Amino acid sequence: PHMENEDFCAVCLNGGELLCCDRCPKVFHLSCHVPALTSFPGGEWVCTLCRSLSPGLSMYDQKKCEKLVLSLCCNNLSLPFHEPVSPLARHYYQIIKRPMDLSTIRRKLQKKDPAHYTTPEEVVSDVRLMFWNCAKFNYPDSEVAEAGRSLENFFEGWLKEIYPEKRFAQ
Amino acid sequence: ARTKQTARKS
Ligand SMILES: [Zn+2]
Ligand SMILES: [Zn+2]
């Protein structure tokens, strides 16, 4: 039963077949963890949030950017930005000409992707595009715009914690 | 590793 661990995936909040972190209470679908897992591991397993720290990112930046992106994903305010807006939604894609969501950001952390990030700067730029699109499309007083603004405050906090030696323009 | 099996939402 593993009641020392949560009952819903930290990322998508659904039940099902869940892998338990051995250092925190979070649980994950294999495919919801960052980086995704293809099978259940043997022995002890520690999620990316609990871990301590040449194409693609360097292995240093890879671990930091994975922690940054998973931190966003596990925050429940991020749920409206996990997936692309429904192509049936009214006017969205007439207003937002460069859409961005967390599933795209997660895909581009993989060096096999043809648009893969090569620097943390490119990761931060795509996260900020997500916040920019949220503020442009949604009216400022709406629940989604407020979640966006609050999640951005969380994200700026994590940037200073994970990348104290870096400051990212605008 | 430890695995938990709960019901999905529906
Ligand atoms: Zn999940
Ligand atoms: Zn953990």
Residue numbers in the entry:
A (entry chain A): 965 to 1017, 1039 to 1155
B (entry chain C): 1 to 10
Per the authors:
The paralog of TRIM24, TRIM28, and TRIM33—termed TRIM66—also contains a PHD-Bromodomain at its C terminus. Herein, we determine the crystal structure of the TRIM66 PHD-Bromodomain in its free state and in a complex with the N terminus of histone H3. Our results show that the PHD domain of TRIM66 recognizes both unmodified H3R2 and H3K4 residues, whereas the Bromodomain interacts with the H3K56ac peptide through its ZA and BC loops. Further studies show that TRIM66 regulates the deacetylation of H3K56ac by recruiting histone deacetylase Sirt6, providing the appropriate chromatin environment for subsequent DNA repair and safeguarding the genomic integrity of ESCs.
The residues T6 and K9 of the peptide contacted the residues D971, L977, N978, and G980 of the PHD finger. Both side chains of the R2 and K4 were docked on the negatively charged groove of the PHD finger. The side chain of R2 was hydrogen-bonded with D986, C985, E968, and N969, as well as a bridging water molecule. Moreover, we observed hydrogen bond interaction between the side chain of H3K4 and the side chain of D971. The presence of a hydrogen bond network between the TRIM66 PHD domain and the H3R2 suggested the PHD domain may specifically recognize the H3R2 residue. Intriguingly, the symmetrically dimethylated H3R2 (H3R2me2s) peptide and the asymmetrically dimethylated H3R2 (H3R2me2a) peptide demonstrated an obvious reduction in their binding affinities to TRIM66, whereas the monomethylated H3R2 (H3R2me1) bound to the TRIM66 PHD-Bromodomain with low affinity. This finding was consistent with the structural observation that each NηH atom of the R2 formed a hydrogen bond with residues in protein. Surprisingly, none or limited hydrogen bonding was observed between the H3R2 residue and the TRIM24 or TRIM33 PHD domain. In short, the PHD-Bromodomain of TRIM66 specifically recognizes both unmodified H3R2 and H3K4, whereas TRIM24 and TRIM33 only recognize unmodified H3K4. Compared with other proteins of the C-VI TRIM family, we found that the side chain of the glutamic acid in TRIM24 and TRIM33—D986 in TRIM66—was excessively long to form hydrogen bonds with H3R2.
